[PDB]
Symmetry: C6
Subunit: 86 residues, 6 copies
């Protein structure tokens, strides 16, 4: 299924992204990951409409308190991707 | 129960955030976490009034000596969140 | 076989690079790797034409949403290299 | 017992902080910790007067050769804190 | 035997350094190592003429695509060094 | 015995520091350590005159090719220190 990602400067603004994502639509939180430099990513999985909706709300609410760096929906990640994230 | 987060540049200013949080109201300290770039987060759990009060005081005193980057209260984190933090 | 690499600032823009690479031609995703400072690299392996094509498309689409820092095709990495990456 | 912390840019200036702290008064060195971005913290434990004295001297001498970012004395850390550091 | 080192911003430009080093003369690739901040180092071992030649070529080609930060040849590293790198 | 430290931006300039230290006087290389942000430290142990001499030469030669951030000789580190480094 689809993949929603919000990447932030700082963990707290990511936790908010994550929280607001899971509340806003039927997505399961996969995890987070940071790549140094303050960059932290929250990743969720769901149907594409559900994921699209989480990321919209995730970004709205994380931006409210912090910096959203990038957000993305991949409606059907190559299988190779889906292996690597989960 | 609710979740209080204070993210700082540097560990020392975080340790102060944490200390002042636990003193200021009935919250238990979950842990800290850094995501590189000097960004360190202190996280506590309690009732929402108790958590709201810790963060107010946590931020007051960490700022006294260092840089508070983000603070947040989530009164009821999606269950998925509560799994990830603890 | 050949080696395609796209290095980005931030994980999300890398995940897109990776996704678009594997879709665009017959390459298998080896992995990713970050070296701090927000720098994350996606690496794939395939025939040189297939790899060249992934990287072209990987870069097109990662840039769409984020910053592509370096991209490279090594058509035949020294064997020592191929040992290190995989 | 009390807690003394000196956070520096760079390890060497921290090692000096630490050395000068333990020489200057009756404190035991707990450890150090870095949170990326060059930020390294030296932490000691002792009575509040002993700890206050180490940090004064720790800071004097680390600054001599490097950058002291934060210093702090917590005379009685919440028990939760004392669990986290040690 | 001697030691050749090329340090880069970013992994990809390092992988090129490495590849071009091993192709250009009779050296075996020891490994790479990053120290955060985007800084990644490729290290090879060989006779001093062979190593000198790799680094010349390693630097030429890594610079072609990325940033070479430092390069070095140590014709006979103190034994202590040779222990630490390998 | 005494402690000599040279901290550099980048590993390569550190390796040179280290090499030139061990050549220049009777010191044993303890190790290196990085604290992110490109900051890498080389640490040696010897008599104070031997250590003083290494660091002088270590710094001369590392600076030749890179950036020496801090250098230090501690002629007799508090015992607590000597425990932590080794």
């Amino acid at each position: 299924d689809a993949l929603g990602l919000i990447e932030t400067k700082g963990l707290v603004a990511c936790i908010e992204a994550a929280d607001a994502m899971c509340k806003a639509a039927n997505v399961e939180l996969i995890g987070y990951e940071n790549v140094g430099s303050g960059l932290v990513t929250a990743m969720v999985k769901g149907d594409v409409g559900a994921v699209k909706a989480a990321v919209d709300s995730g970004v709205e609410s994380a931006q409210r308190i912090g910096e959203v760096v990038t957000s993305l929906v991949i409606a059907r990640p190559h299988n190779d991707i889906s292996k690597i994230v989960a």
